[PDB]
Amino acid sequence: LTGTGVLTESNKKFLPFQQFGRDIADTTDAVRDPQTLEILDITPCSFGG
Amino acid sequence: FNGLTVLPPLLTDEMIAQYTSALLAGTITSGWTFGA
Amino acid sequence: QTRAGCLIGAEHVNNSYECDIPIGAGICASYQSIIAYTMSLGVENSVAYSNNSIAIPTNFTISVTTEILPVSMTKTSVDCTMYICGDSTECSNLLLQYGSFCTQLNRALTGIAVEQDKNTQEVFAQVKQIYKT
Amino acid sequence: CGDSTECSNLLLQYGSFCTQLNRALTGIAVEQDKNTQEVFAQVKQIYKTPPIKDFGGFNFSQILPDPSKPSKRSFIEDLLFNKVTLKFNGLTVLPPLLTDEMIAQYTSALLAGTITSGWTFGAGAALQIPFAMQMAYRFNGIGVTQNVLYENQKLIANQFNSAIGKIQDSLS
Amino acid sequence: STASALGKLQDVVNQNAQALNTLVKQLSSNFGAISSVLNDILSRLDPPEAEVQIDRLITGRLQSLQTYVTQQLIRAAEIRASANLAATKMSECVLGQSKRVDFCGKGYHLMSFPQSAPHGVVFLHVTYVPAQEKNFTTAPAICHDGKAHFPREGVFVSNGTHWFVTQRNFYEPQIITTDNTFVSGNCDVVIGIVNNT
Amino acid sequence: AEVQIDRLITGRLQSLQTYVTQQLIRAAEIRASANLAATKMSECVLGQS
Ligand SMILES: *[C@@H]1O[C@H](CO)[C@@H](O[C@@H]2O[C@H](CO)[C@@H](O)[C@H](O)[C@H]2NC(C)=O)[C@H](O)[C@H]1NC(C)=O
Ligand SMILES: *[C@@H]1O[C@H](CO)[C@@H](O[C@@H]2O[C@H](CO)[C@@H](O)[C@H](O)[C@H]2NC(C)=O)[C@H](O)[C@H]1NC(C)=O
Ligand SMILES: *[C@@H]1O[C@H](CO)[C@@H](O[C@@H]2O[C@H](CO)[C@@H](O)[C@H](O)[C@H]2NC(C)=O)[C@H](O)[C@H]1NC(C)=O
Ligand SMILES: *[C@@H]1O[C@H](CO)[C@@H](O[C@@H]2O[C@H](CO)[C@@H](O)[C@H](O)[C@H]2NC(C)=O)[C@H](O)[C@H]1NC(C)=O
Ligand SMILES: *[C@@H]1O[C@H](CO)[C@@H](O[C@@H]2O[C@H](CO)[C@@H](O)[C@H](O)[C@H]2NC(C)=O)[C@H](O)[C@H]1NC(C)=O
Ligand SMILES: *[C@@H]1O[C@H](CO)[C@@H](O[C@@H]2O[C@H](CO)[C@@H](O)[C@H](O)[C@H]2NC(C)=O)[C@H](O)[C@H]1NC(C)=O
Ligand SMILES: *[C@@H]1O[C@H](CO)[C@@H](O[C@@H]2O[C@H](CO)[C@@H](O)[C@H](O)[C@H]2NC(C)=O)[C@H](O)[C@H]1NC(C)=O
Ligand SMILES: *[C@@H]1O[C@H](CO)[C@@H](O)[C@H](O)[C@H]1NC(C)=O
């Protein structure tokens, strides 16, 4: 799963069979690392005109 | 966000309320005479 | 069966009430079970006209009614390259030869936003000073 | 696609343009219906003219509904209807919610209310007022004292009748 | 208590949100290409036909964006019309008493009060509505001494025995006097005269 | 046949979108006319102007 953004600690709960959640419109919002099996949070860095 | 942004309105809700209150006090105390 | 089409699951009624869920061709349905009937315009009355009779009211009431009007919407801006290419170089190069669509695309949205601010300003800022009760 | 499975599969991957198209068309249709509703349904009840008609010499016979015709439409309305003249592969025409008969009913109700009551029935409950006693007010609203109307009642009625005949002749 | 009263504003908000949401959702459409994700199609081919696939994506997304802009323009025109109407009502009913029938409020108008709303305005119109009618007998003129008297302002009524002049919107009789009626010639031509003093 | 079907689909879709847009413009015009008609109905039939 390839994507760009900043990674932070997340308190959301995955069931032991999911791998990565989303919120709406199919935009990834939380990913669990394959190694330490920890749920993170994804937010892209700000852009502006 | 995916390259799509929302911009804040120039007038915040507070000054909108201020306009409404000014209009309403004017129409109570003065009537219509403050419209000219 | 009606002019609008074929209706299944509702039973006809010879009466006539107000219209709840409009169906068409002058008929509509409502809930008692579900019934479909003919729309009724309202209570029919015959005003007692003559050539030497008038009716003058004797009392009055004061009523207060609401009226709602939208005046604005959210101002939105868009970026072409981020939206279409998703931060890629070759995609940007390919898009480069399509001429300048993006200039007028952004121009239209900018005009929309300016118009929104103008709308609110002209609707509300009808006074010069700020009075106080 | 014209009822073809492969065309439908190919079209399926073009996103959801069709939902937007159908939504827009449905919005247009609902707008049409609400449009007619707001322009015509301006009254709360349905009024009726008295069986005997003596409007101070004025003559609305060419404008009031005629019971002979089943549609109960006035003569001018029939002329207008006869003047103008007007489902294959997905196109469909839906009938209006209000048929012509109820449109004629609202027209007749408005017209009979404004003959008898005046402007009052739009602002509460209709009140009786003789028609010769109503045009007087309508003079008093344009800077002409009511003194005129009563002294020229018959002439005004004749002019109104002649105009209402000439309008029919020109239209026909 | 009653809900579903702020219908128009809620519908406006929902329309804008839905348009934005479907515009975002359009990004996951193949549009006739092998995949809707750009990185994979770049990483799974060579430029010769990768540029063709990217051309497909560019065309599709450009059409989507163009359609979205067009809808925005149409809705903006409609909202501008509504805002112009709102400004007219604000300047004609709030800052003055209106005379045009059924412009603001059902009945005779008295005043209006504005209140803000998340994306619009709410008017409270105060109107005057008569009630408790009655029945009377009228006559367009009064013959006295052979002359005709017409009312300065009001209308003639009678409760069966005596005649009075009243205002036209609230039952208030007054005895007829030569200072609220004016003369116009002799009464042999008006249709509806009645004898009185 | 896939490419030919794609061409036909694109052309017909473009035509349909054009038709819908013209319908929308005409509908806005008709709505403005009907608003004027309703105003005239209220102001001139239900009272003097
Ligand atoms: C991959 O191997 C490493 C090395 O052991 C695992 O890391 C250990 O994880 C457990 C439980 O999470 C800890 O108690 C150990 O202290 C960790 N060891 C080190 C050296 O950090 C890791 O969990 C493994 N990943 C898997 C199995 O998915
Ligand atoms: C006009 O209407 C008002 C109410 O709309 C009447 O006021 C009521 O009068 C009765 C008897 O006098 C009282 O029992 C009620 O409590 C009154 N209501 C209010 C709200 O005050 C008034 O009497 C009517 N006047 C005329 C002349 O009809
Ligand atoms: C009101 O106007 C109508 C207009 O049609 C008059 O009806 C005509 O009356 C004349 C004379 O009686 C007849 O020769 C015509 O044939 C009638 N026309 C129709 C279509 O019936 C009617 O008489 C008028 N009423 C009054 C009281 O003047
Ligand atoms: C004014 O008088 C007329 C004539 O009597 C009234 O009209 C009738 O009123 C009676 C009331 O007993 C009803 O039964 C009739 O049905 C009415 N006639 C019609 C044609 O509807 C009228 O109601 C009176 N107005 C007021 C305000 O009392
Ligand atoms: C019509 O109204 C007039 C004036 O109000 C009435 O005349 C007087 O009515 C009072 C009672 O309201 C009596 O005490 C008087 O004797 C009446 N006459 C005079 C000269 O004052 C009249 O009675 C009313 N008639 C009807 C039928 O309502
Ligand atoms: C109001 O209408 C009545 C009834 O139609 C008219 O009364 C008629 O008056 C004439 C004389 O003017 C008599 O020859 C009739 O017999 C009366 N008819 C009835 C049924 O009694 C009255 O003239 C009309 N008045 C006005 C001003 O229009
Ligand atoms: C109103 O009063 C006039 C004036 O008296 C009446 O007109 C007279 O009527 C009588 C008999 O009807 C005649 O002998 C006179 O020649 C008429 N003129 C005059 C100057 O007296 C009239 O009849 C009365 N009634 C009405 C309804 O007008
Ligand atoms: C309606 O009336 C017709 C004839 O008057 C009758 O045949 C029919 O059964 C009636 N329907 C109902 C639901 O009463």
XYZ file of all heavy atoms in Angstrom, chain D residues 73-124:
397
model
N -64.987 25.080 -19.490
C -64.045 26.133 -19.823
C -64.775 27.256 -20.542
O -65.721 27.018 -21.295
C -62.915 25.600 -20.703
C -62.028 24.594 -20.007
C -60.727 24.422 -20.747
N -60.955 24.269 -22.176
C -60.471 23.275 -22.905
N -59.715 22.332 -22.370
N -60.752 23.226 -24.204
N -64.330 28.484 -20.305
C -64.987 29.626 -20.913
C -64.675 29.673 -22.403
O -63.812 28.955 -22.912
C -64.557 30.917 -20.234
O -63.150 30.994 -20.144
N -65.393 30.543 -23.108
C -65.282 30.585 -24.560
C -63.886 31.011 -24.994
O -63.301 30.426 -25.914
C -66.337 31.529 -25.120
C -66.725 31.225 -26.523
C -67.255 29.992 -26.844
C -66.570 32.163 -27.521
C -67.620 29.697 -28.136
C -66.934 31.872 -28.817
C -67.460 30.639 -29.124
N -63.330 32.024 -24.330
C -61.995 32.496 -24.674
C -60.962 31.408 -24.425
O -60.001 31.259 -25.186
C -61.664 33.776 -23.892
C -62.815 34.769 -24.008
C -60.393 34.393 -24.414
C -62.986 35.327 -25.390
N -61.133 30.641 -23.351
C -60.211 29.544 -23.088
C -60.281 28.496 -24.189
O -59.257 27.926 -24.580
C -60.511 28.925 -21.726
C -60.316 29.888 -20.571
C -60.212 29.188 -19.233
O -59.216 28.469 -19.012
O -61.128 29.354 -18.403
N -61.481 28.227 -24.704
C -61.605 27.292 -25.816
C -60.911 27.823 -27.060
O -60.241 27.069 -27.775
C -63.074 27.008 -26.107
C -63.607 25.861 -25.290
O -62.790 25.025 -24.852
O -64.837 25.788 -25.090
N -61.066 29.118 -27.342
C -60.369 29.697 -28.484
C -58.864 29.557 -28.329
O -58.163 29.180 -29.275
C -60.747 31.164 -28.647
C -61.802 31.464 -29.703
C -63.101 30.767 -29.365
C -62.007 32.958 -29.815
N -58.351 29.841 -27.133
C -56.918 29.722 -26.897
C -56.451 28.283 -27.057
O -55.394 28.029 -27.643
C -56.573 30.242 -25.505
C -56.738 31.746 -25.314
C -56.852 32.079 -23.845
C -55.571 32.474 -25.936
N -57.225 27.327 -26.543
C -56.836 25.929 -26.662
C -56.834 25.465 -28.108
O -55.945 24.709 -28.513
C -57.762 25.051 -25.829
C -57.202 24.698 -24.489
C -57.469 25.485 -23.384
C -56.396 23.585 -24.336
C -56.949 25.163 -22.148
C -55.872 23.260 -23.103
C -56.149 24.049 -22.008
N -57.811 25.896 -28.898
C -57.856 25.491 -30.295
C -56.907 26.288 -31.173
O -56.696 25.909 -32.329
C -59.279 25.619 -30.831
C -60.166 24.487 -30.378
O -59.714 23.565 -29.701
N -61.440 24.549 -30.741
N -56.333 27.377 -30.663
C -55.412 28.170 -31.470
C -54.100 27.431 -31.695
O -53.719 27.149 -32.837
C -55.162 29.521 -30.803
C -54.817 30.630 -31.776
C -56.061 31.167 -32.458
C -55.714 32.265 -33.443
N -55.504 31.732 -34.815
N -53.393 27.106 -30.620
C -52.088 26.468 -30.739
C -52.262 25.011 -31.139
O -53.286 24.378 -30.862
C -51.291 26.589 -29.427
C -51.062 28.043 -29.083
C -52.013 25.878 -28.310
N -51.242 24.477 -31.806
C -51.203 23.081 -32.221
C -49.820 22.526 -31.927
O -48.814 23.199 -32.174
C -51.525 22.931 -33.711
O -50.705 23.829 -34.469
C -52.991 23.238 -33.977
N -49.770 21.305 -31.407
C -48.498 20.664 -31.097
C -48.055 19.743 -32.232
O -46.974 19.913 -32.795
C -48.595 19.893 -29.774
C -49.592 18.740 -29.617
C -49.048 17.416 -30.148
C -50.003 18.601 -28.160
N -42.214 7.854 -26.930
C -41.884 6.577 -26.310
C -41.302 5.605 -27.325
O -41.995 4.705 -27.795
C -43.122 5.962 -25.660
C -43.340 6.378 -24.219
C -44.340 5.463 -23.529
C -44.182 4.020 -23.986
N -44.869 3.068 -23.071
N -40.031 5.791 -27.677
C -39.390 4.952 -28.677
C -38.194 4.181 -28.134
O -38.178 2.948 -28.184
C -38.975 5.819 -29.866
C -40.133 6.386 -30.619
C -40.561 7.680 -30.381
C -40.814 5.619 -31.548
C -41.639 8.205 -31.069
C -41.891 6.136 -32.239
C -42.305 7.432 -31.999
N -37.182 4.874 -27.620
C -35.923 4.230 -27.265
C -35.335 4.824 -25.994
O -34.141 5.125 -25.923
C -34.934 4.315 -28.424
C -34.691 5.733 -28.871
O -35.175 6.681 -28.256
N -33.950 5.889 -29.957
N -36.164 5.005 -24.971
C -35.725 5.505 -23.683
C -36.337 6.830 -23.287
O -36.439 7.116 -22.087
N -36.740 7.650 -24.248
C -37.425 8.894 -23.937
C -38.814 8.590 -23.396
O -39.476 7.654 -23.852
C -37.517 9.787 -25.175
C -38.489 9.404 -26.296
C -38.718 10.585 -27.219
C -37.970 8.220 -27.095
N -39.247 9.368 -22.411
C -40.550 9.185 -21.797
C -41.104 10.541 -21.396
O -40.363 11.424 -20.964
C -40.460 8.267 -20.573
O -39.862 7.023 -20.955
C -41.840 7.992 -20.006
N -42.414 10.701 -21.545
C -43.099 11.940 -21.211
C -44.008 11.668 -20.024
O -44.866 10.779 -20.087
C -43.900 12.483 -22.400
C -44.804 13.612 -21.953
C -42.959 12.946 -23.490
N -43.824 12.425 -18.950
C -44.713 12.151 -17.832
C -45.832 13.180 -17.772
O -45.602 14.363 -18.034
C -43.943 12.165 -16.514
C -42.574 11.494 -16.567
C -41.849 11.661 -15.250
C -42.727 10.030 -16.912
N -47.050 12.758 -17.435
C -48.159 13.701 -17.400
C -47.999 14.678 -16.251
O -47.364 14.360 -15.232
C -49.386 12.795 -17.197
C -48.844 11.623 -16.475
C -47.453 11.412 -16.998
N -48.552 15.879 -16.369
C -48.523 16.812 -15.243
C -49.387 16.313 -14.101
O -50.342 15.561 -14.297
C -49.087 18.103 -15.840
C -49.940 17.642 -16.958
C -49.256 16.441 -17.531
N -49.033 16.737 -12.888
C -49.812 16.342 -11.720
C -51.223 16.911 -11.773
O -52.193 16.209 -11.465
C -49.105 16.788 -10.444
C -49.940 16.687 -9.172
C -50.279 15.244 -8.876
C -49.207 17.315 -8.007
N -51.362 18.172 -12.161
C -52.663 18.818 -12.233
C -53.177 18.736 -13.664
O -52.529 19.241 -14.585
C -52.555 20.275 -11.790
C -52.621 20.547 -10.289
C -52.783 22.031 -10.022
C -53.749 19.763 -9.659
N -54.336 18.114 -13.857
C -54.884 18.086 -15.201
C -55.541 19.423 -15.517
O -55.724 20.279 -14.650
C -55.895 16.956 -15.376
O -57.015 17.166 -14.515
C -55.256 15.631 -15.032
N -55.909 19.594 -16.787
C -56.473 20.862 -17.232
C -57.749 21.212 -16.485
O -58.063 22.397 -16.316
C -56.742 20.805 -18.729
C -55.560 20.283 -19.505
O -54.470 20.874 -19.383
O -55.715 19.275 -20.224
N -58.495 20.205 -16.032
C -59.769 20.479 -15.383
C -59.581 21.243 -14.079
O -60.268 22.239 -13.833
C -60.522 19.176 -15.134
C -61.618 19.305 -14.097
C -62.739 20.214 -14.552
O -62.885 20.416 -15.776
O -63.474 20.729 -13.685
N -58.649 20.806 -13.228
C -58.445 21.550 -11.990
C -57.815 22.911 -12.247
O -58.039 23.848 -11.474
C -57.613 20.762 -10.977
C -58.315 19.547 -10.392
S -57.254 18.144 -10.015
C -56.623 17.727 -11.618
N -57.026 23.049 -13.310
C -56.532 24.373 -13.667
C -57.699 25.294 -13.982
O -57.750 26.443 -13.524
C -55.553 24.283 -14.848
C -54.514 23.197 -14.595
C -54.880 25.612 -15.059
C -53.415 23.614 -13.665
N -58.664 24.799 -14.756
C -59.856 25.588 -15.037
C -60.630 25.882 -13.761
O -61.221 26.956 -13.617
C -60.739 24.862 -16.046
N -60.640 24.936 -12.824
C -61.348 25.156 -11.568
C -60.714 26.276 -10.754
O -61.419 27.148 -10.238
C -61.386 23.870 -10.752
C -62.417 22.870 -11.216
C -62.851 21.946 -10.104
O -63.108 22.386 -8.984
N -62.924 20.655 -10.399
N -59.387 26.262 -10.610
C -58.713 27.374 -9.943
C -58.966 28.688 -10.655
O -59.183 29.717 -10.007
C -57.210 27.135 -9.832
C -56.785 26.104 -8.824
C -55.495 25.607 -8.824
C -57.656 25.659 -7.849
C -55.090 24.681 -7.898
C -57.260 24.733 -6.914
C -55.975 24.247 -6.945
O -55.572 23.320 -6.017
N -58.912 28.686 -11.984
C -59.166 29.924 -12.705
C -60.559 30.450 -12.398
O -60.730 31.634 -12.078
C -58.998 29.699 -14.201
O -57.636 29.361 -14.479
C -59.366 30.948 -14.959
N -61.560 29.575 -12.448
C -62.925 29.997 -12.173
C -63.081 30.468 -10.736
O -63.803 31.432 -10.472
C -63.897 28.860 -12.462
O -65.133 29.094 -11.816
N -62.424 29.796 -9.793
C -62.540 30.189 -8.393
C -61.944 31.569 -8.164
O -62.565 32.427 -7.529
C -61.860 29.155 -7.501
N -60.739 31.803 -8.683
C -60.134 33.124 -8.568
C -61.035 34.179 -9.177
O -61.251 35.247 -8.592
C -58.777 33.143 -9.263
C -57.565 32.638 -8.494
C -56.509 32.157 -9.461
C -57.019 33.735 -7.615
N -61.588 33.884 -10.347
C -62.334 34.893 -11.077
C -63.663 35.199 -10.395
O -64.062 36.365 -10.294
C -62.509 34.408 -12.508
C -63.086 35.276 -13.600
C -62.495 34.754 -14.868
C -64.567 35.121 -13.643
N -64.343 34.175 -9.884
C -65.584 34.403 -9.158
C -65.349 35.061 -7.812
O -66.207 35.815 -7.347
C -66.333 33.089 -8.962
N -64.217 34.789 -7.166
C -63.898 35.504 -5.946
C -63.643 36.976 -6.195
O -64.129 37.832 -5.454
N -62.890 37.293 -7.248
C -62.575 38.690 -7.511
C -63.742 39.457 -8.110
O -63.753 40.687 -8.028
C -61.366 38.814 -8.433
O -61.057 40.199 -8.615
C -61.655 38.213 -9.780
N -64.715 38.780 -8.720
C -65.919 39.496 -9.133
C -66.741 39.903 -7.921
O -67.217 41.040 -7.830
C -66.755 38.655 -10.109
C -66.027 38.474 -11.430
C -68.105 39.287 -10.337
C -66.714 37.497 -12.323
N -66.919 38.992 -6.972
C -67.823 39.232 -5.857
C -67.158 39.999 -4.720
O -67.629 41.071 -4.334
C -68.366 37.904 -5.337
O -69.230 37.325 -6.319
C -69.141 38.124 -4.064
N -66.064 39.468 -4.182
C -65.457 40.006 -2.973
C -64.538 41.193 -3.239
O -64.567 42.179 -2.500
C -64.687 38.902 -2.257
O -63.775 38.286 -3.144
N -63.706 41.111 -4.268
C -62.766 42.178 -4.544
C -61.339 41.757 -4.270
O -60.904 40.699 -4.729
N -60.594 42.572 -3.534
C -59.256 42.191 -3.113
C -59.231 41.565 -1.730
O -58.166 41.135 -1.278
C -58.319 43.399 -3.131
C -58.804 44.545 -2.329
C -58.737 44.682 -0.979
C -59.384 45.751 -2.826
N -59.268 45.887 -0.598
C -59.669 46.565 -1.717
C -59.701 46.219 -4.102
C -60.255 47.818 -1.844
C -60.282 47.462 -4.226
C -60.553 48.248 -3.105
N -60.375 41.498 -1.053
C -60.382 41.048 0.330
C -60.064 39.569 0.449
O -59.401 39.158 1.406
C -61.735 41.334 0.960
O -62.671 40.348 0.518
C -62.223 42.698 0.531
N -60.515 38.754 -0.504
C -60.382 37.311 -0.352
C -58.940 36.838 -0.414
O -58.679 35.674 -0.099
C -61.213 36.584 -1.410
C -60.570 36.529 -2.759
C -59.815 35.437 -3.137
C -60.734 37.562 -3.655
C -59.228 35.387 -4.375
C -60.151 37.514 -4.897
C -59.398 36.426 -5.256
N -58.008 37.690 -0.818
C -56.613 37.307 -0.798
C -55.958 37.618 0.530
O -54.830 37.193 0.792
N -56.667 38.352 1.383
C -56.151 38.820 2.665
C -57.112 38.470 3.790
O -57.455 39.301 4.630
C -55.894 40.322 2.630
N -57.566 37.222 3.816
C -58.468 36.785 4.862
C -59.669 36.024 4.344
O -59.524 34.977 3.708
